[PDB]
UniProtKB/Swiss-Prot annotation:
Effect of E75A: No effect on binding to CIPK14
Lineage start: Eukaryota, Viridiplantae, Streptophyta, Embryophyta, Tracheophyta
Name by which UniProt lists this protein: Calcineurin B-like protein 2
Function: Acts as a calcium sensor. CBL proteins interact with CIPK serine-threonine protein kinases. Binding of a CBL protein to the regulatory NAF domain of a CIPK protein lead to the activation of the kinase in a calcium-dependent manner. Binds four calcium ions per subunit. Mediates the activation of AKT1 by CIPK proteins (CIPK6, CIPK16, and CIPK23) in response to low potassium conditions and in the context of stomatal movement. Mediates the inactivation of the proton pump AHA2 by CIPK11. Probably involved in regulating signaling responses to abscisic acid.
Keyword line: Lipoprotein, Membrane, Palmitate, Phosphoprotein, Repeat, Vacuole
Residues of the whole record sequence present: 32 to 220 of 226
Amino acid sequence: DPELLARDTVFSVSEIEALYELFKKISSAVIDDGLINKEEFQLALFKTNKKESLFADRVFDLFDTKHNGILGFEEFARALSVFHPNAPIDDKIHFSFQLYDLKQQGFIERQEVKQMVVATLAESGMNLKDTVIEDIIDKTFEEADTKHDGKIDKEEWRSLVLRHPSLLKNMTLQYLKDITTTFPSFVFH
Ligand SMILES: [Ca+2]
Ligand SMILES: [Ca+2]
């Protein structure tokens, strides 16, 4: 039932029904098989470029319940729900932390902060050399590492992103607000 999805996610029953149309488009975009793969999901997030695709694939991984490289409708709906422009900021902050906390240890170190920096630059259309990335990592700790212990907390992360909302730019897909009326074009290249 679309009633169970609407309840467990930020979408309303009518948004879920519209999301099913989006699902048919996205699941058909590369291989027409009724399923969503990583390349198709990249298309849904406008993250098809080889540097931007890492973020989309990490998101994919968190919602791929069976770890089989495929998402069905329910998984897709859940995946997209936090990207809704009306999803609470706290859901976006919480989810984005899980994203960069690859080891699920409750904190991020430089290697994980590096991924966040790379993903954050990619959103602004920017790719920098390793040594410049390392300087930005330095500044991020300077800023976020309030409780000095060489790692960024969930609480230090929330604080960081509240002072710098442009870090949650990749956590919103603007087209989801208007899903009951209009649809973007998605074509694979
Ligand atoms: Ca497919
Ligand atoms: Ca800390």
